[PDB]
Symmetry: C3
Subunit: 229 residues, 3 copies
């Protein structure tokens, strides 16, 4: 956990060396309290005004009134009314990555996703062990920003547990307010979200490597590079 808006020093003296050594980097106090609170207010307002999905279907029985649903999501561009501070976070994330370019592995980052805002509703659901990009879709770095004030995992659960490749250990990350996490999106970092027993919010952006994305366009072929005659 390194310590932070100014961040070139953070990128060059902490994020780049940490990513190249461990593949997992945690920055605490990324935006500061005023800004982090504004983002949390925007995300709660999206939740309270019904902009999230109903949640991943976790258990489906004969009676659909008992169906259990987990993580809820919404995709945010950063330009929508009421999402301007999420947009500021995304710009901040983008400036950090730009300052790392050419220094994160041998990747050359040239694109990203929209922001994926996730809400674990606090009903004991988590997210199963997975790899974000197991099949070469172009995503090289996962970046998550957490929004949960005074989170106490001893009673609320919700820890991100990463299983770094080749090492016999876990890396456990609490989803703390104003924490920014980076990790390699491929099979080097399988991970899971342990059951959350309180409402838990996070915002994820994935960053794309230019070479991997260019050749993915053949595999994930759409109309895309398909055109008329």
């Amino acid at each position: 956990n390194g310590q932070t808006l100014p961040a070139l020093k953070l990128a060059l003296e902490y994020i780049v060396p940490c990513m190249n050594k461990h593949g997992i980097c945690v920055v605490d106090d990324f935006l500061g309290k005023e800004t982090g609170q504004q983002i949390g207010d925007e995300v709660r307002a999206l939740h309270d005004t019904g902009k999230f999905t109903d949640g991943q279907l976790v258990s489906q029985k004969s009676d659909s009134s008992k169906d259990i649903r987990g993580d809820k999501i919404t995709w945010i561009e950063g330009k929508e009314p009421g999402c301007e501070t999420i947009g500021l976070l995304m710009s901040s994330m983008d400036d950090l990555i730009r300052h790392c370019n050419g220094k994160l592995g041998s990747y050359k980052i040239n694109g990203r996703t929209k922001a994926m805002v996730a809400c674990y509703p606090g009903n004991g659901t988590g997210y199963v062990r997975h790899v974000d990009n197991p099949n070469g879709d172009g995503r090289c770095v996962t970046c998550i920003y957490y929004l949960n004030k005074d989170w106490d995992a001893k009673v609320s659960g919700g820890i991100l547990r990463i299983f770094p490749e080749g090492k016999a250990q876990f890396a456990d990350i609490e989803p703390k307010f104003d924490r920014l996490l980076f990790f390699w999106s491929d099979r080097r970092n399988p991970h899971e979200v342990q059951p959350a027993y309180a409402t838990r919010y996070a915002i994820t952006v994935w960053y794309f490597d230019a070479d991997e994305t260019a050749r993915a366009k053949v595999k994930y072929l759409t109309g895309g590079v398909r055109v008329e005659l």
Copy 2:
């Protein structure tokens, strides 16, 4: 087989309870004869003016003049010249689904496909056993409208056979004129089209669940949620 343009009673008293109990619902006389005949005329005109593909490649030998092809398709938005009544069918299907919303399982339907018009040419080809959505691409309900007047499966074949999960039985559906079929698109309903020995037309729309579709955008990643820096 329930019985039908007015249809809120049909949705609430038949379609919703049948889908939640059996996963497979058949509505006969959905649009009535005048309208059903107009749709059939539009589809035959698309066929006769060459708008369908040449058909699924079924057998490919050394000599391509003998290649066997099966089902032919065309994708219809519903706004094209000469497709206005298909467009009316799609609007009718959409109004029905809207009246079911929140009541079909725990799904929240927020999108659909264009209409897939299919023609089995009558040369003994059918469609192999499959699941429509086996990998979580967002499609929750399959809706098929049939256009075949006086169909007699005893001589023309072409029955849809569904293999509902967990039950040791078949559900056999004849592709009858003005019949509308609903079934869950996932692995609950593997199905096949038995060999058709007469020209057989159907129109399919798939309906998307909001949560499943939102998270599919990560799996089926395109430029999509991918954007520039």
Copy 3:
């Protein structure tokens, strides 16, 4: 290796019979020297001005300064400044295919990709054995144009080796200047690029079959045939 801008005779007397018999067709002197040299100049200028990716990641060790990268690519529409002659090549390829239509197997070609320009940097990397379209994504014909003057595979490597299905033999194709290659994109033609020890350029376009592409839209579902309610 048949012999060539005029080419209807080439399509009808050589390409069509060769593709239907062998699945692999080589045309030498396709555009002639003046035009081929102009294309090579355009491709080298894209390389020299940094328009290619950094190359397929081949070896990734703990230290990313030693990472080995292979083939570099760029996607070209044919209308960009400085790509007009690539655009002429693409138009030439498209006119040839149009003159074959209905005669290549039972396919009906109705679309293509943008041009994929590839550069093997000459560092001993090649491309592993693969099939271009193994899963039914609509691509029926692969068309490659080579740009390498006085290529000598005895010292530079870089041969395309195809492993035609059912036959116990290789088909070895040198990546010669102004050579145009056609082959079926599916599992009939697994192939590899043997290690290249000099800079090696090629331009690939894939051609889509109408039926296979229409039904791929269901499998590779995007927002695509997905639309709002």
